[PDB]
Write a protein that binds this ligand. Sequence first.
Ligand SMILES: O=S1(=O)CCN(Cc2ccco2)CC1
Ligand SMILES: O=S1(=O)CCN(Cc2ccco2)CC1
Length: 487
Amino acid sequence: RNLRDLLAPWVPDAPSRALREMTLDSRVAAAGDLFVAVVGHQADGRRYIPQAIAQGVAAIIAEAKDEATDGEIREMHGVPVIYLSQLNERLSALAGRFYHEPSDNLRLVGVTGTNGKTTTTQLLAQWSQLLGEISAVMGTVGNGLLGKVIPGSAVDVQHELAGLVDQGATFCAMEVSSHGLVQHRVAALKFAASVFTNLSRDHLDYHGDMEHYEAAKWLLYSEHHCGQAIINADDEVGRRWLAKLPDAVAVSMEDHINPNCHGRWLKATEVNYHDSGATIRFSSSWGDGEIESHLMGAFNVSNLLLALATLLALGYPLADLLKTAARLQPVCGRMEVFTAPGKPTVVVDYAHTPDALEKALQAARLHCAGKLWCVFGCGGDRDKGKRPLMGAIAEEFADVAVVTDDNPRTEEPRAIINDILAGMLDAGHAKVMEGRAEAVTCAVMQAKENDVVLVAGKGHEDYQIVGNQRLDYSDRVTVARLLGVIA
Ligand SMILES: O=S1(=O)CCN(Cc2ccco2)CC1
Ligand SMILES: O=S1(=O)CCN(Cc2ccco2)CC1
């Protein structure tokens, strides 16, 4: 790594300097490093130039605004200071070059939108790896090779992706946050494909506002290497964009494919939501088939179809995708289904808010021939407002509400339960059982073979905080033990 080579595309005849790491933070800027001084929302990195020089950085790249012209080479205490205009916009490209263009050395798929980003990202990584890739994820959960995700500037993005390349990753599914995109944090990444789970957003009822939102985004996307566009046609904005993008792949499970366009497409023709997942019949420009998904609810059908369409667009054979689809797993504690022969279906989900609980019950309902049970509580020593709302939701969208404990902490467990029950029309119809394990056992042991029991609130979070103790407890383990299966 050399300053001269680093800057060659932009600043010819830049000094020759060996560079260790690239950093925006003058605090950690050690000897031999390249310090990058950026002008930010409320901070100006150029302030910390003398400090960085004092810690022995090899060279500095600094925002040119007001202080210099673009590509201006200066020299302070023997250290090169190269000024570049619009450094924020160029930082991704700069870092990309520094870290040997990691997105050109694996298949990078970017997923954007509000809902289903995490799941779709995870399914992309899972499915690609089942097809022979060494897959990785980058996003809100964390970064890492599949099953070793460790819990973010344009430099960090490039740096982490290079780290994954070094660990042998050949495929990376990246969640792209709306904010990350706008702030040019993925500006120079070569995306093999970009998946749009949706492009809708609240607060856009004024026609001028929707117009500006779309223009802003369209402009942004025009400036990125998006690769193959895979768009959810069940989204209103998605459809309008698909109408303008003849090379984009349209995906639908609600009959929004327009075949007159002769574009590439994938649609679910029918779905059977059964006790252990969904059987998805689909047609596509690549051929038709049938997938046995072990994921629950309509949203996860959409998410799966988006991943399928993406991988098909990237040229993975339909037959191989079909042969591996049954091995796709739910994201841990996200509508994770547990079945056993002749037992009720039990779903463990992390849902701990009124909206999450409602969605999880609506999803569970689809797979439920009999009665839908909901076992849940609310956290103690936290905001109490959601309690009656979650009570009301459990009453409305389930057949049997089993109200129990969930991390009561120092608060009186029964008081929390009372707040939950307060929101119900017929609290008397609810079952109350304290001891969460006992409540789960009650639902599971009493529920019929064709019932579904949703156990909500914890998902993967395997502890019960009672008083000051994080006592060892797991919904997944409790459920697995009751059903005679392995969590
Ligand atoms: O830019 S982003 O939208 C996509 C990449 N992510 C993951 C990331 C990289 C380094 C630290 O965290 C940040 C948000
Ligand atoms: O589809 S996009 O995400 C990326 C490409 N851009 C510009 C464009 C349209 C047709 C040719 O170039 C639109 C947004």
